[PDB]
């Protein structure tokens, strides 16, 4: 076929020409699929072998069924990612190879109950939750420091502030750090079409601060669109589970004390205004370490400042190189 070979040359030429163009936006996957095994790809052999919970970058537009993208790994080339409708179509192909998909069981019962597949056997139903396979996540995952206890107290604030200072100085010219006083745990996507569109409604949500929470969500996306590294300084985060179900998916960096005895001796030497909060502070210390390590992204358990700083720096440096 002369049509497939000619469109192959044009597609390859487009990839070479577009290899030096700015990145437009990014999405996040949640299903295990391969971009090479599919026979509908316009270019064969240049697919992506991605897995569940992977990050892809999109630069230009191809069509309503396919897109051009590249991985976030070091030295990642350009691959093709199926469209959400195409992924929905290929999801239906995964559940059709089975013997049955609707109500009629095939337990040696053939010839009596035909039972044509109703709407319950298609994608029209099962819309109670309808988790989207593709989500419009920010262009990069933000960096957040959490623990070992609640923020706003003396024991906690300098440790992140000094760590922010080291990140700011080492990444001079490529860092943009801002303090978000608004809440970040209420970043929802399937609540309503437009919750509190106007502030003059004088409703429960119109007069509340919820509209401020969602307004800051788009600010992060635009800030992440600048390609510069961003670290959030919010003090409304105490557990990765509160931000786990959000679309931000930040880099959960956990710094922890080696022993509770070490922490309970640091609080004593701080000042009389801090032992009043010792009881509540110790509550967060035990509940945060009870979270499994795999929930967090990178751990900071070193007892020396120099050991942890470059341990975190190399994780951030490799991300900068891999995403370029």
């Amino acid at each position: 076929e002369s049509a497939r070979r000619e469109v192959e040359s044009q597609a390859q030429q487009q990839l070479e020409r577009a290899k030096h163009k700015p990145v437009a936006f990014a999405v996040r996957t949640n299903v295990s699929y391969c971009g090479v095994l599919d026979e509908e790809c316009p270019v064969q052999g240049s697919g992506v072998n991605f897995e569940a919970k992977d990050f892809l970058h999109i630069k230009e537009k191809y069509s309503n069924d396919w897109w051009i993208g590249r991985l976030v790994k070091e030295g990642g080339d350009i691959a093709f990612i199926p469209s959400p409708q195409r992924l929905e179509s290929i999801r239906l192909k995964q559940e059709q190879k089975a013997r049955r998909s609707g109500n009629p069981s095939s337990l040696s019962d053939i010839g009596n109950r035909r039972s044509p597949p109703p709407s319950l056997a298609k994608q029209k139903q099962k819309q109670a939750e309808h988790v989207p396979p593709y989500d419009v996540v920010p262009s990069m995952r933000p960096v957040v420091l959490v623990g070992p206890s609640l923020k706003g107290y003396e024991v906690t604030d300098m440790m992140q502030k000094a760590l922010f200072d080291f990140l700011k100085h080492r990444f001079d010219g490529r860092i943009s750090i801002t303090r978000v006083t608004a809440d970040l745990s209420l970043a929802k996507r399937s609540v309503l079409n437009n919750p509190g569109k106007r502030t003059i409604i004088e409703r429960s949500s119109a007069r509340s601060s919820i509209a401020e929470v969602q307004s800051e969500i788009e600010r992060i996306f635009e800030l992440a669109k600048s390609l510069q590294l961003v670290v959030l300084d919010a003090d409304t985060i105490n557990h990765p589970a509160q931000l786990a179900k959000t679309s931000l998916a930040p880099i959960i960096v956990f710094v922890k004390v080696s022993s509770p005895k070490v922490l309970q001796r640091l609080i004593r030497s701080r000042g009389k205004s801090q032992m009043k909060h010792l009881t509540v502070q110790m509550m967060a210390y035990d509940k945060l370490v009870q979270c499994p390590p795999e929930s967090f992204d990178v751990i900071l358990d070193e007892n020396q400042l120099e050991d942890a700083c470059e341990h975190l720096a190399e994780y951030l440096e490799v991300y900068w190189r891999a995403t370029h």
Binding site: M158, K161, V262, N303
Partner: peptide, 14 residues
């Protein structure tokens, strides 16, 4: 574990 977590916890602001 205490010496490294005491100077750093105070020198950031003080």
């Amino acid at each position: 574990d205490l010496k490294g977590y005491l100077d750093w916890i105070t020198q950031a602001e003080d």
